[PDB]
Amino acid sequence: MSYNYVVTAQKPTAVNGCVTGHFTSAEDLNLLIAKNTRLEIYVVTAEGLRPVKEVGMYGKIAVMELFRPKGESKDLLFILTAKYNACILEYKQSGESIDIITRAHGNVQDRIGRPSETGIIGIIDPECRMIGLRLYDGLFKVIPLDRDNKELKAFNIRLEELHVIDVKFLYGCQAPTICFVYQDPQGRHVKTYEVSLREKEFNKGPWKQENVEAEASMVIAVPEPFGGAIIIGQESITYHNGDKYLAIAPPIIKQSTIVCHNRVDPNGSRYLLGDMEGRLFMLLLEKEEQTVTLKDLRVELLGETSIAECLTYLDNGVVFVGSRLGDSQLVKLNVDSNEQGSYVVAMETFTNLGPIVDMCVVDLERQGQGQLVTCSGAFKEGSLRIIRNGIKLHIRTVPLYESPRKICYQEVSQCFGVLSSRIEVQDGTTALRPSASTQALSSSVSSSKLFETSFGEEVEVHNLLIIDQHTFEVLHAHQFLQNEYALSLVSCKLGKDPNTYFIVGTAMVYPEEAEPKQGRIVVFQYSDGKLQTVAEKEVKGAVYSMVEFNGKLLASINSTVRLYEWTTEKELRTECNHYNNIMALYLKTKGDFILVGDLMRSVLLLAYKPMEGNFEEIARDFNPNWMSAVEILDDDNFLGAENAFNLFVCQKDSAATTDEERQHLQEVGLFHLGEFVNVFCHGSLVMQPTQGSVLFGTVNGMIGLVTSLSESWYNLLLDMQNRLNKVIKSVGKIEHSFWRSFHTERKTEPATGFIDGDLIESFLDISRPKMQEVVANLQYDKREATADDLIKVVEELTRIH
Amino acid sequence: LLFCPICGFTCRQKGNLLRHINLHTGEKLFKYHLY
Amino acid sequence: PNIINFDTSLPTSHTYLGADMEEFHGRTLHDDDSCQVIPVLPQVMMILIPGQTLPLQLFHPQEVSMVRNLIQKDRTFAVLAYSNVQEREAQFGTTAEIYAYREEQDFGIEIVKVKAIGRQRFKVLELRTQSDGIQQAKVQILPECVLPSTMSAVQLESLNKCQIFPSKPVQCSYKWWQKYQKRKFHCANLTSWPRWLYSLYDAETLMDRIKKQLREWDENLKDDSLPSNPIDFSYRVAACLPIDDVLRIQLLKIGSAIQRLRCELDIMNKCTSLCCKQCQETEITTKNEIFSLSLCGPMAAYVNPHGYVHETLTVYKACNLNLIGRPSTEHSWFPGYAWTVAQCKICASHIGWKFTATKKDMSPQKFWGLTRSALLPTIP
Ligand SMILES: O=C1CC[C@H](N2C(=O)c3ccc(N4CCOCC4)cc3C2=O)C(=O)N1
Ligand SMILES: [Zn+2]
Ligand SMILES: [Zn+2]
């Protein structure tokens, strides 16, 4: 009963996987990068990366491995998607035509099983005898890598260790041995098994079971002639091989967890390691011949990069650093350190807009074309991103070196108000690095009468930053009270006051209290380059959200919705209250309607009654599920994002006979987006068929657009989707309907009420014979639809973003 | 001597027994309970 | 509130009912939303929470025959959650699986003693009377909505490894929970909400807070004595809370363990006093007096010699109670203790009993058991 259209204005930019090998040809050195649903294949050259291809997958790439079974001249690519679609693909080039062949594919889902705590694990035997998957606790799935197994038919082997933390395939074994670190009440142990395909079962591992560090997390399968494995934990790096045992406890790696690694040398003599704070180390394996055996382990701090999700060493000291929290990097490892003792020098930076935690659409140049200003990144990678359509999407970066959380725009003062957070070590606290909040032109610290420790303890300092819209310099930085957490920010006029204010909601958060018991609503005015605290109100809870409601202020305090009026004395006077029994995390408004939402999808819809001066529960829809954002498309339709990365639409249908149906929001649209939407925002990026425009920003840095379609256009485009799915060859042979089906966990239903804009737009990139196949016996305005009419329709659709 | 089927109330005369038993706020399903 | 030398496992056995009874271990469950038809006992009227034990005595021949039939087949009947006791409203109910049965011919009449256990909540689709006087009801088996972790969707693949914490140590708790929050909800920086906000919806954190608030009721409350599953823990807490019937109905309606735990924490933090139902101002006790003398928590259901079911809450102190009778060990619900009738001082209505230890070496020497149906919660 709803008709919506979703397009990707910006493709996902966060990197969640990178591999190196020989995929395009036996001689080329290829780098493969996974950006959620995109796969980018580059050829590594002395001049950097040469993009060879980019492919769209109908899934979230969770596993991506390259292997070369005996008889193959190039590497084959094994990919598993978050919905458990497995595929072995090959790279075929005919003249100038590039196409990723699908050598084999299947779905390795099990109808039963709890998804593992540590997520999906996918490994391949060094001899390419099989693929080992860890998807559910207590089971180990084996896919024999026999060329006859074109359906990727796997079998399970029971694991006696339910809490497996990591697992790898060992080198130099006559049988496909696995070494894995797991946990039990007695601590963490490294254990080895010997997989048998003939018997489809485990066998006693080569060496033995052994006890490891309490925080052992990472397993590295060292190649020949070393063999064995390296276990990396919080404080120690150990090497186990048969009876041989080695250990080191370097103090450099003790201030951050090592999360990613990569083998530098083919013989395993060098490894790259990366911590959670952007430090890049080198691990060196000193070998001595007696047969070659390991002599010692040494760790060196190569330098500092962007906070790395994955690392891969390409060649000639060049390393690609794929990051989720910041721009990906191409850096070079120098032989000798520079003046600051860093061996790492950045060569290239690849843009990454994710995570987008908030954004606002503003017409800075006032040409009638909006620009999207987003709070992207986290920690030292935090920044503002100004995105505008070019004459294809020009992006400007404003580094902040601290996490930006909320953003709003003030036309009168020509500035943005940005809530930001910086981590400070409780030394009495000191900043880790210079950041926007500390280097502001002028600054102030909250001073309100209202309201243990350790050296290594970390605390969050929250600031309101006034940033010029032209130079994007930090004009002002106001620091909030200690332990105060700034949650909401609006800029608006109130009452008869002709001034425009920045209004901030904050909660007093202490580690002792489970939920905040007191909080603040602060009203600042930015005038003549000064930020003055015009008013201050104490409330008994956390002000989770705030909105200007028809000249008044509508705030959400814990589980209450409070409407304040702005009296002549410039103070907030409570006009009315409403109690919902749910924490009003999301608070949207349209006209006199208020949408109140909870983290568990408990949606309700209130209406303000001016004559009665009170709220009334117009409608309600409670359904246990995690919810990340909501928006009001129009008076009736409400759009939200929920678990398993899917959009949903709820409809009120006030013209219902029975009062039960008048108080129910029937879900009228579901669509597996594949992205975790963080923020919704009404606006458009094109100069001002479809109605409305709601941009949304997600965790992977993707920006999408949702608009409303008429029933006729929705039916036509649904028909077009059905036509195309039979014509377009999906990579990995994943069905589009399965990809876009609502997912959750073991509970999937087909998507409805949503037109996949990307699939429609792909109609323009197919050969004319394919277009003719797609357009056949179709009805267009009835009449006999022709290829050119659909080309015109798709071209019109492409202009909304 | 008189017992209350609901609680262990004990009393001598009968009027108080009926008063208390009726005081019990409940459907007092005497049909399904008393021996 | 002396140290409990008492074997808290005693009352849960319902030794007062009689000697050993035919115990059935044949657990029976119906698939989610599976439509079923089940019988009903008109005698029972209590709100049964799944996992809570309901003891009963039946003397009427119709009920005896019905339970005899139930022993064959599944041994599962229904308990209607009467929103309004009159006219048997019964918009929701709970399946009770009979797990103990005994038969006796004392008094010259056939008598059957039963112990059932709540198994599954359900919605009543159709309630119809049979020719034998045993109502048979249509049952839509409500499901247990199990949600994944809040950060399961937003979780960096690199940090997925190391998500398993080492263990809990046998200030230390505060530091461990700070570390747990910091590590579990790190990827909360990828979203628009803080870590503590996600902690407010974390199953483990909510159970820990509930345990912290329960420990005041039992100093010997070893963790193993409380369920570790969020669903079982939530149902146990809901069964042990001294709340009115409307709140019990509300807790039964909720299908998600997270929501049940949040509502339970709200109720615990709000309710303060326990007052007389037949009055409106005579406060019989306060939450601070609630203490657990059983493995089932402070509040549990027992039967009298005439089959009436009382949900008694055990406390170490009561006020405004007029005592009647003499300490009688007969049919005492707490072995080694003698009971006496207790009435409200103002309206002289039955509120509960006072129990006194029969041995001088037994602690606590005295305490009280107040019937839930004879009390109402009072907020300040
Ligand atoms: O803990 C306890 C205390 C109360 C409870 N109870 C009753 O409500 C009750 C009512 C009448 C009773 N009589 C039946 C006839 O001859 C003696 C008096 C006995 C009880 C009794 O034990 C119980 O069974 N166990
Ligand atoms: Zn009585
Ligand atoms: Zn009274």
Coordinates of N, CA and C in Angstrom, one line a residue, chain B residues 12-26:
Chain B
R12 N -15.7 -19.6 67.9 CA -16.6 -20.3 68.7 C -18.1 -20.3 68.2
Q13 N -18.7 -19.2 68.0 CA -20.0 -19.0 67.6 C -20.1 -19.0 66.0
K14 N -21.2 -18.9 65.5 CA -21.4 -19.1 64.0 C -21.5 -17.8 63.2
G15 N -22.1 -16.7 63.8 CA -22.2 -15.5 63.1 C -20.9 -14.9 62.7
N16 N -19.9 -14.9 63.6 CA -18.6 -14.4 63.2 C -17.9 -15.3 62.1
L17 N -18.2 -16.6 62.2 CA -17.7 -17.5 61.2 C -18.2 -17.1 59.8
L18 N -19.5 -16.9 59.6 CA -20.0 -16.5 58.4 C -19.5 -15.1 58.0
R19 N -19.4 -14.2 59.0 CA -18.9 -12.8 58.7 C -17.6 -12.9 58.1
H20 N -16.6 -13.6 58.7 CA -15.3 -13.7 58.2 C -15.3 -14.4 56.8
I21 N -15.9 -15.5 56.7 CA -15.8 -16.3 55.5 C -16.3 -15.4 54.3
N22 N -17.5 -14.8 54.5 CA -18.0 -13.9 53.5 C -17.0 -12.7 53.2
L23 N -16.3 -12.3 54.3 CA -15.3 -11.2 54.1 C -14.3 -11.5 53.1
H24 N -13.9 -12.8 53.0 CA -12.9 -13.2 52.0 C -13.3 -12.7 50.6
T25 N -12.4 -11.8 50.1 CA -12.7 -11.2 48.8 C -12.3 -12.2 47.7
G26 N -13.2 -13.0 47.3 CA -12.9 -14.0 46.2 C -14.2 -14.7 45.9

